[PDB]
Every structure is written in C-alpha cells, then in structure tokens.
Symmetry: C3
Subunit: 151 residues, 3 copies
C-alpha cells in the first residue's frame, strides 16, 4: 500500500511562507533538515519544501496524506487557503483563519504511468502582503510526514 514517504524533522529556520494571492508552492529553505525518504519517494527537485516526488508511479488511485505541525496565516484577520497539487490536479483543499492546519489528504487518479510526478502543498493569502506559513522551526517538536498510499 505504501508507495513512499518523506519525513522532515523540525529545525531552527525551517519556515516556509509567501503572500501570493494565487495558489503557489513554497521554495527551498537552506536551514531545513534533509528529509528522509522511503520506497518510491524522493525529495522534490525544487529542494527542501512541503512536497514529495515520485520519479515513477504506476497508473492507479492514490491517497496522499500530509501531516505537518503546523501551517497557519501569520497575521490575525487573514484567511489562507491551502491545497494539495500534482502539477495538474488538486485535492484536499483547506482554509485557516486565526487557526492552523495539521493534516491534509487528497485523492488522485492516473490512467497512465507517471514520470517525474511531484505533489506540493500550495497556499494563497486572501489579503495582499499578508503571509501564509508552514512552520517546522522547533526541533524535537515540529515535524512533517508525507506519504502516498496506493488504493
């Protein structure tokens, strides 16, 4: 069932955020721990970000789960939408407003074998200049686990 997984332990400085009003992925942050991967999974070519890469994935139905402590809008009074994104399709949209997100789940289907397939956490802020954040800065506490189940 487990196609692959990716685990990133918290580390000072490992915080992703942007104020894009359109959905956008996060980008590499040098301070992050390298993620440990298993199975068919690898780090995204974009580097240390909330995401997971499958160089090869067979046709089929998949459930993607992101466990992250945690994601939230940085400022009060700001609404942030988050989604899981494979470059083409999205699933598992969620929102945060003076609140946090700790888990996202998405359903994805492929009729043909995939190559170089990356799943991303994306976010959009509903107030320009106000950031949406994914935060694993506290060692020993914060953690991200991403894993893909073949159904």
């Amino acid at each position: 069932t487990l196609m692959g997984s990716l685990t990133m332990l918290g580390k000072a400085g490992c915080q992703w955020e942007h104020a894009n009003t359109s959905f956008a992925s996060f980008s590499n942050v040098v301070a992050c721990n390298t993620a440990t991967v298993t199975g068919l999974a690898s780090a995204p070519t974009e580097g240390k970000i909330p995401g997971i890469r499958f160089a090869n994935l067979p046709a089929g139905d998949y459930e993607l789960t992101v466990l992250i402590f945690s994601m939230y809008p940085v400022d009060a009074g700001v609404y942030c939408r988050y989604r899981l994104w494979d470059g083409t399709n999205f699933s598992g949209m969620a929102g945060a407003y003076e609140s946090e997100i700790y888990q996202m789940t998405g359903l994805f289907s492929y009729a043909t074998d995939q190559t170089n397939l990356t799943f991303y956490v994306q976010a959009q802020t509903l107030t320009a200049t106000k950031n949406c954040r994914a935060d694993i800065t506290v060692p020993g506490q914060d953690k991200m686990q991403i894993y893909l189940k073949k159904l």
Copy 2:
C-alpha cells in the same frame, strides 16, 4: 482497496443546507453538477447530495472519506454538528462554529454482504431556523470527493 468513489465539481448554486435540530441528510439541489463515479459506487438515489451509494458491498471493514471545501454554519454564533451515516450507524462526528469542515472520516463494518447501502453526510443545527451548510459553489476551487476503502 478503493471500493468506489464519487466526485462532484463545484458550480454556482450548488450548496446544501438545512436547519434541522435532529441529524439529517441534505437534499437534492438541481443546480449541482452530475457526479462522476468509479468502481462499485453510484449516486444516491436521492439525487445530487453529499453522499455515495453502493448497490452491493461485501462484508468487511471500510474507511469512508469525504473531502469537501467546504461545510460551515451559515450564521455566526451558531454551532453545527456533522456526522457520517450509513442508515444504521454513524461515525466521524465533527463540529463547526464560525469555522469550517474540509474533511470527514468514518469507520464502518459489516458482517454480511450489503445491498443498496448509502453513506450520507448529515448535519444538525443547535439553533432552530439557523442553517448548517455544505457549499461547493466556486468552480475550479470547490469540489466534493467521497470514497470508500476496504480495509
């Protein structure tokens, strides 16, 4: 294993609500898109609602997942309870108060093969006349994905 799935893409006017103080399913809204189904799944006989039907389902243990952006109480100051319901048992109860639900998960088991088995999202308001809502009115942003896994 993925027993079946049901996907409805968002569309203006496709929102469900009621103000029942007893748990109740939502009812057909004609503006909604026709859902697409895979595997053993079909649309509820009640029509375009948050739910999924299995004309036949083997004995077994099953995890039901509902991904939906989004469900919320229409008015501020109003508490809404939501549950997953198979006609006999409930699972995965959640609440909302000036807040949203994006996902629901339930565990259901059957000792014998089932026929005409429908799973429903149900809701109950804690203030009469004040509605609980499920809302997929924004095309390209909102979507409902319901799927059942055999454990």
Copy 3:
C-alpha cells in the same frame, strides 16, 4: 485484512479525561467510562479506560493510526493545547486547539522489527500552566471514540 485492530468506546456521563501537564502526557483511567470494545489484534491499554489502543503483538512494517473522537478541547478560553499520538518511543500527528476542538488525529508509525506489548496513546500538553486540556465523551448516544490501526 489491513485493519490490524480497532477499539471503540461509546459516550457515557462522566467519561471525560483532563489534565494540565506542561509536558506531553497520556490520560489515566476514568471509572465512569464504558469498557472498550476491541477487534483484531487489539486490546484495551493496561492503564485502563483511556484514549489509547494496545497491540500485544504487531509485525514489523508501516502503519497508519486513526483516532476519531468527538471531541477534545481546552477547558478554558484563551488556552492553547497540543495533542499528539504516541507509541512510547515516537510521536506523530501533532494537532492543536485554542477555543476550538479536535475530532480526528492521524499518525504514521514504522517498525523495522516485530513489536510486543505496544500501546498507542493520545497525549496532551497545555501551554498555560494549571489550565486543563480535555478529551470529552460524556454525552451518551452522541459522543464516541473509535481508534484503529491500518497496515500500509
């Protein structure tokens, strides 16, 4: 079957667990709670009627642990509580609450070798000393707790 086992506890007046540990801690036995119902490999935790599930044995592999519970929350306004799933060695599925509730937790756990006497716990931590974090299933016919482990 990938369902290694499950544990179910139906709501009952007085079945509420709470503490104010500033460090992550499990809950302890509450006498007013219903006894749990279990399936598969699972058993009730040796600590008693608590948010948790026990696996007297579990083969090496990868597992997803789900807790469905209506509900967990900080007792007081203005207090932040963290919850996490714990197997005595590692944690997963950390969640938080603040004038809000938790209804589901999910964790990913892996074992390179066969496990014996393995218990999974819901643990909590308050960020305001002396202010309780609670798991509440005191309403009969409405509240309940379902815990289950799936082999991946």
